[PDB]
Design an enzyme around this catalytic site. Structure first.
Site, PDB file in Angstrom:
ATOM      1  N   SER B 197      25.851   9.342   8.993  1.00  0.00           N
ATOM      2  CA  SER B 197      25.113  10.565   9.366  1.00  0.00           C
ATOM      3  C   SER B 197      24.643  10.412  10.814  1.00  0.00           C
ATOM      4  O   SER B 197      25.465  10.251  11.703  1.00  0.00           O
ATOM      5  CB  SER B 197      23.929  10.787   8.393  1.00  0.00           C
ATOM      6  N   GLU B 324      30.070  16.772   1.579  1.00  0.00           N
ATOM      7  CA  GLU B 324      29.024  16.561   2.565  1.00  0.00           C
ATOM      8  C   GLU B 324      27.871  17.572   2.625  1.00  0.00           C
ATOM      9  O   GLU B 324      26.780  17.213   3.056  1.00  0.00           O
ATOM     10  CB  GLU B 324      29.662  16.490   3.957  1.00  0.00           C
ATOM     11  N   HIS B 437      26.660  13.354   0.243  1.00  0.00           N
ATOM     12  CA  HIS B 437      26.432  12.830   1.581  1.00  0.00           C
ATOM     13  C   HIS B 437      25.673  11.510   1.468  1.00  0.00           C
ATOM     14  O   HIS B 437      24.642  11.447   0.814  1.00  0.00           O
ATOM     15  CB  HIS B 437      25.592  13.852   2.348  1.00  0.00           C
TER      16      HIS B 437
END
Lengths: 532, 532
Positions: B197, B324, B437
């Site tokens: 991320s 995601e 995610h």
């Protein structure tokens, strides 16, 4: 005598003709308007003056002056559409096929030929009304109308070439059927008009135009609707093209009178030799002289008319062919050939898109390209070919017809939609062209019933099914037999949006004919081109 | 002693820790910068001053001051990401896991945690370096850096809050690893930085920033790249948000000095209580204080840097997770719930699109909606849910990473791409969220090897495969074993664009990871938003 008929315009002498080892009557070349020659060119049609004696209606009339395709000399595939009679400005006649014995008050069907408003004849073999008149027992009428500059030159504001005189021609013929078909056994209160391509667009225009609404009961539209991007122009573009036409023939352009008079002194073939030089863009599927939104034939703009319910409410039956665009790519887009698989490269794909959506800015061309490209296989020549084919058909025929049907069904009294996806076995065009524009016509007129033409047994079966649908619909407003045991062609509703495939396989009902693309061509692209 | 190490900053005393019924050394909480407190807040980090005596590195350090998620109190699913240590402005420390016996010159891996640049800790259970250090025999380092306003407040032009000081923090830690990891057995010329991320975006930023390029050999980026729409802002928007932050805490806004001084007198929790009030739009997947293109850390704009090849050329390994976006829709889009199937209506779908593409005009929102709607089934709640899910992931993680990888591979020395699509069997989040995610992380750190956590046998096998890929790549620049008999992770090339799926099934190679949508988000939409 059965071949003698006395109409309100005078007596008419028809001829007996053989059909499917039997016979029917045929009245060919009956006039419905004065010959639009000399000073009458570009002018509105006038009613034919009554005549004494008997008019000989045993042979086809002449064909309107028009452009003639010579892209493939000899090729039946293309010549079967060219005029098969002497061309002449004196072309306004109609043909009638009457069952035998003569009916007392049977259903009438009036056919309006297509041809992009620049060509077409009522005398083509493909348009022979005898098979249908015979098989379904209906009075079959085919009219004619002026095309090209002769029927669509528009200099709004003057009365020497108001425009849409070609549509007035059709209305004239319809007015005659309304005033005389009763003497041929037809029922004037049950006339269905039906057409293809420009003819389908014409049918949709009589449904919209106040002056034509009362002249027919029902309508059938094939591969064409009034709101097609090629079927009409503004009075400004009409004026702009009339002038450029005059500039090409070295005419005095100081005034409408100046221009019109010079254009009237010209030989028919001279206006036709330069007719294609007036198009605003390098394009495909676009024509020089077509109907124009003038505030008369068409009260306001077509879109506001469709939104306000301002149009004849009745029942309509319409549909499209699977591969509507292939014919125009063959003649105009680089990469396509009559004798090859025509696999298109990325280069030619994009050139094709530029040619298909002529009025789009670079952002729009990008939107179209993105919407029709499979980026997991972008250099697949067969995918780019069919992608280009889909674009031309969707943008020019399918997405526009689905907009019309969805707007109409909201105020209509019944809608029936079809999707014709059967490629005839005797087609002479290459395979990559698929179910070609205008080839559903042969099934509608029943050519498959005549052995010598060489159709399969299932193709003849299909032709009868379709002939019974069209005819049963013309008589009742419903293509289905009341208490039949056969499959039912469901009604199209704003809610369900059902439609049927039309081929040699067991009927199948579907929904939302090409919605994905129709939403793109009718909602998104217009909006994008307007904001940018 | 094995737990005693003498670095260039002073002596350090580690502690022995048990791992997979064995042991390794751990040096926790080693400082690499002076505590950024008081007058140092918002300022660039300064090198830690050497210390006498032995530093006790046997317990984790504090966590940087940050926003703490309380959307689901108790829920392990969300708390496992919250800080598990006392928060404090004095947070700049790093953790080292060294194999036993101590290596002489083994491969080093430096991990940079994610968290949208507003949260994150190096001390989370999920980030325990011992399993990986042990299993692959590498020196594992995890650093920390300031997040939120504390690390990204940007008032370009002044030296009291230049901006990007959070990235300078990481660079500082990297500088220390470069100058001292040799004393822990690591090889300074073979350090791979890797993150997730915001951490993946950070790794990509050291690859671009001239000042960081010489501090590492290779890089691994997970679900994040430098050019992500949420990872950076202009100096103007940075300035605009710094001011609004000050307006929320009633600060004198006459000058940068005025503002900064007032912000320095504030308690940490006060800047955090109003931090989210400065976002320009109602949005999803966007954060208040993130890196800013200042002309220093980043010479020019990111796009021109990627186009000019202005960046560290080396080998990189990267990829994304299948789903995601689901995590941000759950917390911010109307219609989604942790305890329901979250079927979304047309109403909420479009509200979601407005929230996902905050900077788009109405024409753009229409383009996105059209691109992600199946008009043959527009009211299917499960299709609208997954459609919204795809939008958030594509626009925020996948399409941006594919743009980076395609630009990088043109000047790089080797690229390896993966697509992680395996949903762990012990996930506590609902099923509709899919491969969430940040959940590939647990496999990278090898949590599946510890029985008590409850993973399937194939999940542990997957964890070892991935750990060997990451580690083998860190050592050689290639995830594959030289003469192995196992399946080969093909190299990603500008031409073929191959990538592999990463799950518990026999490896499969694919091509053009989500091209259709990537062309939309990277080529068409940008263009559309610019012309209109």
């Amino acid at each position: 005598s059965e071949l003698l008929v006395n109409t309100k315009s005078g007596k008419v002498m028809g001829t007996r003709v053989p059909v499917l080892s039997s016979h029917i009557s045929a009245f060919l070349g009956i006039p419905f308007a004065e010959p639009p020659v000399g000073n009458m060119r570009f002018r509105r049609p006038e009613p034919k003056k009554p005549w004494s004696g008997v008019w000989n209606a045993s042979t086809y009339p002449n064909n309107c002056q028009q452009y003639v395709d010579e892209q493939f000399p000899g090729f039946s595939g293309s010549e079967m559409w060219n005029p098969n009679r002497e061309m002449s400005e004196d072309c306004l006649y109609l043909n009638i096929w009457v069952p035998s014995p003569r009916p007392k008050s049977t259903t009438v069907m009036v056919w309006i030929y297509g041809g992009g408003f620049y060509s077409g004849s009522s005398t083509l073999d493909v348009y022979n009304g005898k098979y249908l008149a015979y098989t379904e027992e209906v009075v079959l009428v085919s009219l004619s109308y002026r095309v090209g500059a002769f029927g669509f030159l528009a200099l709004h504001g003057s009365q020497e070439a108001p425009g849409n005189v070609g549509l007035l021609d059709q209305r004239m013929a319809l007015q005659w059927v309304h005033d005389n078909i009763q003497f041929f056994g037809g029922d004037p209160k049950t006339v269905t008009i039906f057409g293809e391509s420009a003819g389908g667009a014409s049918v949709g225009m009589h449904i919209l135009s106040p002056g034509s609404r009362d002249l027919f009961r029902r309508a059938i539209l094939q591969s064409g609707s009034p709101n097609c991007p090629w079927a009409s122009v503004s009075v400004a573009e009409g004026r702009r093209r009339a002038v450029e036409l005059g500039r090409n023939l070295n005419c005095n352009l100081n005034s409408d009178e100046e221009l019109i008079h010079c254009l009237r002194e010209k030989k028919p073939q001279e206006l036709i030799d330069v007719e294609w030089n007036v198009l605003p863009f390098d394009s495909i599927f676009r024509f020089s002289f077509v109907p124009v939104i003038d505030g008369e034939f068409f009260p306001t703009s077509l879109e506001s008319m469709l939104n306000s319910g301002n149009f004849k409410k009745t029942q309509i039956l319409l549909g499209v062919n699977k591969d509507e665009g292939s014919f125009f790519l063959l003649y105009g887009a680089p990469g396509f050939s009559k004798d090859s698989e025509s696999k298109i490269s990325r280069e030619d794909f994009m050139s094709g898109v530029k040619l298909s959506v002529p009025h789009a800015n670079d952002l729009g061309l990008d939107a179209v390209t993105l919407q029709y490209t499979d980026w997991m296989d972008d250099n697949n020549g067969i995918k780019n070919r069919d992608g280009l084919d889909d674009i031309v058909g969707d943008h020019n025929v399918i997405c526009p017809l689905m907009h019309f049907v969805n707007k109409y069904t909201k105020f209509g009294n019944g809608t029936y939609l079809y999707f014709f996806n059967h490629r005839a076995s005797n087609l002479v065009w290459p395979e990559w062209m698929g179910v070609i524009h205008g080839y559903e016509i042969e099934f509608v007129f029943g050519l498959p019933l005549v052995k010598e033409l060489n159709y399969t047994a299932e193709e003849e079966a299909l032709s009868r099914r379709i002939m019974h649908y069209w005819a049963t619909f013309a008589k009742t407003g419903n293509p289905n037999e009341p208490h039949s045991q056969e499959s039912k062609w469901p009604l199209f509703t704003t809610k369900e949006q059902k439609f049927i495939d039309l081929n040699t396989e067991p009927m199948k009902v579907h929904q939302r004919l090409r919605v994905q693309m129709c939403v793109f061509w009718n909602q998104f692209l217009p909006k994008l081109l307007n904001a940018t």
